[PDB]
Structure 1
Amino acid sequence: GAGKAIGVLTSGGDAQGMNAAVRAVTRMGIYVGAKVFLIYEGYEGLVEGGENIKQANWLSVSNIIQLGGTIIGSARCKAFTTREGRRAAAYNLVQHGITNLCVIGGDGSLTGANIFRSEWGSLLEELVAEGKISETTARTYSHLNIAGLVGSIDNDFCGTDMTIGTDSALHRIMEVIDAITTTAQSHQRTFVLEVMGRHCGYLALVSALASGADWLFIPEAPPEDGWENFMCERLGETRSRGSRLNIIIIAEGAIDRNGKPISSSYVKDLVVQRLGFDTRVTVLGHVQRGGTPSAFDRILSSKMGMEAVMALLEATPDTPACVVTLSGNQSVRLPLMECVQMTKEVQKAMDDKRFDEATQLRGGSFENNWNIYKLLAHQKPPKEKSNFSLAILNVGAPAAGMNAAVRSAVRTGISHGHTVYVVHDGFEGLAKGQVQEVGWHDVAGWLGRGGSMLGTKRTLPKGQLESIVENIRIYGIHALLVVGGFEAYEGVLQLVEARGRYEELCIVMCVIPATISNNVPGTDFSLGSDTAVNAAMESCDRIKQSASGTKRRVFIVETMGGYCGYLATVTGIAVGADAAYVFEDPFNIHDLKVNVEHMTEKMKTDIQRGLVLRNEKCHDYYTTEFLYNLYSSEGKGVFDCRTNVLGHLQQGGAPTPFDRNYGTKLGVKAMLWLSEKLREVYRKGRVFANAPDSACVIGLKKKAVAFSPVTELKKDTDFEHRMPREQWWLSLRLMLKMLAQ
């Protein structure tokens, strides 16, 4: 499908995830039949050429997906800004016959890449004029096609929801903050944490929202006049009302209303002078730029590298240079100069003190997170004091994020003047009573904890519905917020279907999907799946290290997830697994033979290892012991085989930064929707929710949040296998199988 060349380089500030992008670009370009060249040291080696350019095979990008930084350098170059350096770069690409180029890096590197494209013809004309190349070569390679990848932890680029490497930078930040909180709480100390982000407050905002920071400095929303007094009032209020520690986040580009930089040293000196609290200041530094890439960064970098190869091979000289980005939760493709110009316009608006215009230019998601953070940081005194009463349940298996969602929902409801209850042990508790009212401080510190503080059970309500109705009426509960997995969806569906027989069940209900398996209908991501993929990825990386030490070995790894093969699929992409057997992709004995012979062929190469994943219920008969025996027998003499069963390690320890924020956002938004419906269905002195629109599942669809009615989802649900009919992530299996030889 190709008879042309690809070049790839990384430039600008490195970010952990570039290695996965280089691997995917290389292996997709080889799969399509194109020659791939690795260009070392970025634009410096592009200009210098020679040994800096070398052809890559399938094994050149092997054993790098789990590594941070980049294996091909990404040094900075000054000569490429000049036309002399650019013609030398064009000459080097022509000498190696490279007509396509992939650039991984921030706005500056992509700007230089398009300037290189925009005059490629004139550079070839000059090279022909001086006699470096012949006319036939100039006519053959007369054009240059560019595809851009945005690798940066800052996440400032406008056309992309997530730049390659920002999720892992959040992982490094939260590792640091989780370390600080122990000693800060121990000694009752304030801390000023300086986070990177060149002129952007994304990292600071997300980390503050995930850590429950007591104050935040971001350049997009500079603090108002006399902010020192308001800071001192808040910090005095927290440390007075039971908050043992205070955390202050401050971006490295934070400013006042006059655009003047606010230093972390100033913040320290202010809190000492005006409150006397013992305090410290930590600059996290270049820890954010390194470490292993998180699971989402590897999956995204692989998807974007594949898409970039498709763009380079399907582009034409009339087509403008493009970047590959996120919109919603899919791999869209945008033109490079539009995104470069929009980012520059945002920066100029922020520089011109038009902070409202800069905020409206970036997107409203930042403002919504900023308002959610301010809402949940401190207790605003409520005034509504509605007669409404709520209960919050955990149902299903525990997931990392339940505690974050419960904290968010409880505090939002207390802010709205409701009496909030929490149920211990789910529907089983609500049958057995076990209902207690909860306050603002009763849920403090839950954001950073995995598992379930309330307790969760798989029990469903129809067997104890008389007791459930009794407790609903005793406590006067007017709405339920059931955060959990498929069992939560089933339970709310049973309560809705029993509304005719029982009048007290005429009650508003919302379901927050929270399970590792990602099997609840009505959402793309369930709260807790990201933590589980990261845990499984870490375990499988250790297994690959064990296998590579004991050369000529293959591993069969069993993942959790029921009949849903999401967790095995994305894990296998994240760790370069040679196969992932899944219920949604039926496989017979012939496919197992075909995989065994590929493993035999791979054992002839330098990479003498293997790893195949198996969902815990992908096949009735061909279990993990079956695959062990088959692989051991047909691979006798070539390799040996071992099995691993990742049990409840896949539920993970502490939640990732995404699960913390995702749970917090879902708790707020579900509570807002709950309050709106609850005041809508109030008539003639009593609540009466009977329409199917009053029982819904909050979930993040392809674009944004939606509240699908629980009964409407019934026609798109598999109650036998406990998962939806149609799942968005089946497209990723083609990339998984492609990246494996």
Structure 2
Amino acid sequence: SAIGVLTSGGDAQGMNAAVRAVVRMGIYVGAKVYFIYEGYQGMVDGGSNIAEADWESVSSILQVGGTIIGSARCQAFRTREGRLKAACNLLQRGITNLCVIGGDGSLTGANLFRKEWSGLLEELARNGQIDKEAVQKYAYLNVVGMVGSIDNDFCGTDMTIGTDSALHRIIEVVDAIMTTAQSHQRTFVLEVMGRHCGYLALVSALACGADWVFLPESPPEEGWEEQMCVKLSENRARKKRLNIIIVAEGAIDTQNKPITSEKIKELVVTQLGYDTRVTILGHVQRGGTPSAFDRILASRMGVEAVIALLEATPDTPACVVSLNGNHAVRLPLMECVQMTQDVQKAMDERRFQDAVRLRGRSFAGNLNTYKRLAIKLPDDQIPKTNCNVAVINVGAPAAGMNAAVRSAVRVGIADGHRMLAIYDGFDGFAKGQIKEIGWTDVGGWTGQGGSILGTKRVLPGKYLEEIATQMRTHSINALLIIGGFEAYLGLLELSAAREKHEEFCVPMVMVPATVSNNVPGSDFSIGADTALNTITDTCDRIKQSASGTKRRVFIIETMGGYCGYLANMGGLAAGADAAYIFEEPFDIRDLQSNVEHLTEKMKTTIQRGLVLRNESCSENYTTDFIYQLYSEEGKGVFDCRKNVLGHMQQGGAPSPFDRNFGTKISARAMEWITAKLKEATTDDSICVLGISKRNVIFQPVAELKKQTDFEHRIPKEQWWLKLRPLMKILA
């Protein structure tokens, strides 16, 4: 009936996408929606800090860091006197539906407010408000929270709006700084945010393959000073021309004593005498522009939040909207606030594995993976099989492939295999471009764009004899492929060729890597976040144009092949007005309908348009056709420009999502390989390791055939199609 939305706490990139999603979805469901300026402060002050919102108020906001409606820290809201005055102002305007976008504290605050919402009974016991209105507006205080925080603090949620973006800032800094660690082989201690949370520290570290990291959840344990210094001297012996050490603000040892970045420098300058600087990043990390992931994430939960509020009844407890396993869920607000404090309590009580376990499994996966690729046991202590495992790149280049290779190699070596790097995909395979590869060979790869080993789309079918010859020559006991649809096709071909060539009767696993995200058996592929970010950046600049000129509509063609992932998701994140794709037919009625919408849109103040066309979405309805239609039908009203982005959409260095995705899923694949070799051939030894809903699973290529449209190289059931109605709503 009336919805109020506010933004409390340390601001986060994506907060604006969320407010936009709540205001638009609220209005779309036919509700009125009120801004509450300056977080809880606006609610305490009242009056004009509360103001109705229309469609136009949330445009030009999406692509912008921080909150276009303010975040106040609000002391007053920690006091009964403040909360009475807040509740009063809400009742003044009939607001009893509340959407609160903030962090641990903001949500602890809203949980407390909700419980206390019979502060109304105080209001009546004074003049405050009418007696009968203590019952009209009673405990139908309907609270829903979304966690907007760069820290990944909150317990319920797998992810928080801001984190991906903050990690972008950190890695932009880290990548920038690595070129100045050559002006002397400098050691840089970088101090990142996460006051009582190590997530942002951990992820950064993993993403830039950092030499050491410090988290409060998981302290170093006694004697690390020497072990770290061994690492950094070993690194000068490996000839590494720098060192990078990532330190959470709230890092501690096993006694809860601060490990400060200035402390670390003194240790390194003292023991080793390396030239050493310390950068305190600070509020950069809250700033800049919201990544495509946060824009989309925030947009999905702005919408679920509005549904959760209207679906709520006086029975339903206050909840927190979350994406767990790429599905939007509601979680009871009380319990999540509780669980988060519990994590502080675990650290406070020197119970560190408990803090880590309570953080979620995700946290522990990052931590475990990081250690494995950062600390190398001496050859003496890693005994193990005389197995030789190969690593190859197949498909077109995808950002993150390199990270992936480095991970596979180190985990294999760590598991005591011997790692063979195969060059140029199945081309180099057929021609025997194979060489042994070690731990140091893959150092500094975690953020390299493209493919250093080299990648080709060519399939193995016509080189089975030659390829089988190479496996025999090099005694290849297993194979890991990092690639796109061509890899998948490659496994099918080799699976079928087993009965003629013994050499292919080994465990073969693939992890998916392409900008296109068209690989069957995985909801995500290494490289697509990078691409979405370049698309998102580009559309932002485009709309800025459309906006200066006014009355202009841009038609923009994107990649994907027949896979409308980049187009669709790119559309959402850029706040386009339409994104045509192959998996959703559209006729000239659909086009005329969008054209008529845009026409009406040019009677408002937002006189711009953004239309995205998947490059292979329609035989006849080409980018030109669409450009010609809209140009012509808008004739009294707007004009158009077509742009074909083409292969620059790939982007450059992989985005952190792709680096870590590359790193994490590849290591998980190698684990599978060693476990299999350890029990020493059927369908179960040739599979795709991919992300399916909640968890990662290995799916035999046999099974994926029936789930695959071979003729357009896209899967048959694609998860992101369920999101199609958002674009149109949120526009």
- Match for 1:714 among 685, 698, 705? 705
Matched, 1:53 2:44: no
Partner of 1:126: 122
Question: What is the deviation of 1:471?
Answer: 1.6
Question: What is the deviation of 1:136?
Answer: 4.8
**Bigger mean CA deviation after superposition, 445-454 or 24-33:** 445-454
Q: Distance in 2 between matches of 1:147 and 1:131?
A: 29
Question: What is the deviation of 1:472?
Answer: 1.8
Partner of 2:716: 725
Partner of 2:623: 624
Letter in 2 for 1:357: D
Deviations 1:664-706 (A, max 9, x none): 11221111101111232x3xxxxxxx21111011112211221
Q: In 1, are the aligned partners of 2:34 and 2:50 still within 8 Å (CA)?
A: yes
Q: Distance in 2 between matches of 1:301 and 1:650?
A: 23
Q: In 2, are the aligned partners of 1:520 and 1:723 still within 8 Å (CA)?
A: yes
Q: Aligned runs of 1:571-590 on 2, under 5 Å?
A: 571-590=570-589
Deviations 1:61-100 (A, max 9, x none): 1110000000111112222222232222122112211110
- Match for 1:44 among 41, 44, 55? 41
Letter in 2 for 1:710: V
Where 1:162 maps in the other structure, the secondary structure is coil
**Bigger mean CA deviation after superposition, 356-365 or 216-225:** 356-365
Partner of 2:692: 701
Deviations 1:296-316 (A, max 9, x none): 101010111101101111111
Q: In 1, are the aligned partners of 2:103 and 2:153 still within 8 Å (CA)?
A: no
Matched, 1:244 2:246: no
Identity %: 69
Question: What is the deviation of 1:385?
Answer: 4.7
Q: In 2, are the aligned partners of 1:159 and 1:326 still within 8 Å (CA)?
A: no
Where 1:675 maps in the other structure, the secondary structure is helix
Deviations 1:136-170 (A, max 9, x none): 54433222100001111111211111111011000
Q: Distance in 2 between matches of 1:74 and 1:707?
A: 44
- Match for 2:225 among 213, 223, 228? 228
Matched, 1:527 2:526: yes
Q: Distance in 2 between matches of 1:702 and 1:505?
A: 31
Q: Distance in 2 between matches of 1:673 and 1:129?
A: 67
Letter in 2 for 1:468: I
Q: Distance in 2 between matches of 1:132 and 1:664?
A: 59
5+ residue gaps, structure 1, are: 683-689
Deviations 1:431-463 (A, max 9, x none): 122112212222221111111111111111111
- Match for 1:102 among 82, 95, 99? 99
Matched, 1:569 2:560: no
TM (norm. structure 1) is: 0.97
Matched, 1:401 2:418: no
Matched, 1:330 2:318: no
Q: Distance in 2 between matches of 1:100 and 1:626?
A: 46
Q: Distance in 2 between matches of 1:656 and 1:628?
A: 32
Letter in 2 for 1:234: K
Partner of 2:255: 258
Question: What is the deviation of 1:263?
Answer: 1.2
Question: What is the deviation of 1:60?
Answer: 0.8
Letter in 2 for 1:433: G
Partner of 1:510: 509
Letter in 2 for 1:294: S
Letter in 2 for 1:493: L
Letter in 1 for 2:330: R
Q: Distance in 1 between matches of 2:78 and 2:345?
A: 23
Letter in 2 for 1:501: K
Deviations 1:1-39 (A, max 9, x none): xxx100000011111110001000000000011110000
Matched, 1:449 2:448: yes
Letter in 1 for 2:196: H
Q: Distance in 2 between matches of 1:82 and 1:265?
A: 37
Q: In 2, are the aligned partners of 1:397 and 1:458 still within 8 Å (CA)?
A: yes
Question: What is the deviation of 1:334?
Answer: 0.3
Q: Aligned runs of 1:395-544 on 2, under 5 Å?
A: 395-544=394-543
Q: Distance in 2 between matches of 1:568 and 1:272?
A: 50
Question: What is the deviation of 1:353?
Answer: 0.8
Deviations 1:551-596 (A, max 9, x none): 1100011010011111111111001100000111100011100010
5+ residue gaps, structure 2, are: none
Question: What is the deviation of 1:528?
Answer: 0.7
TM (norm. structure 2) is: 0.98
Deviations 1:106-155 (A, max 9, x none): 121122222222232342x3333434443454433222100001111111
Letter in 2 for 1:504: E
Partner of 1:687: none
Q: 1:226 to 1:473 in 2, by over 3 A?
A: closer
Q: Aligned runs of 1:274-353 on 2, under 5 Å?
A: 274-353=271-350
Where 1:234 maps in the other structure, the secondary structure is helix
Letter in 1 for 2:190: L
The two structures, once aligned, show a CA RMSD in angstroms of: 1.3
Partner of 1:685: none
- Match for 2:725 among 718, 722, 734? 734
Q: In 2, are the aligned partners of 1:405 and 1:664 still within 8 Å (CA)?
A: yes
Matched, 1:598 2:604: no
Q: Distance in 1 between matches of 2:606 and 2:363?
A: 45
Q: In 1, are the aligned partners of 2:104 and 2:153 still within 8 Å (CA)?
A: no
Q: Distance in 2 between matches of 1:385 and 1:227?
A: 27
**Bigger mean CA deviation after superposition, 623-632 or 699-708:** 699-708
Q: Distance in 2 between matches of 1:522 and 1:362?
A: 28
Q: Distance in 2 between matches of 1:718 and 1:269?
A: 60
Q: How many pairs does the alignment contain?
A: 728
Matched, 1:372 2:369: yes
Q: Distance in 1 between matches of 2:590 and 2:111?
A: 45
**Bigger mean CA deviation after superposition, 670-679 or 402-411:** 670-679
Q: In 1, are the aligned partners of 2:229 and 2:268 still within 8 Å (CA)?
A: yes
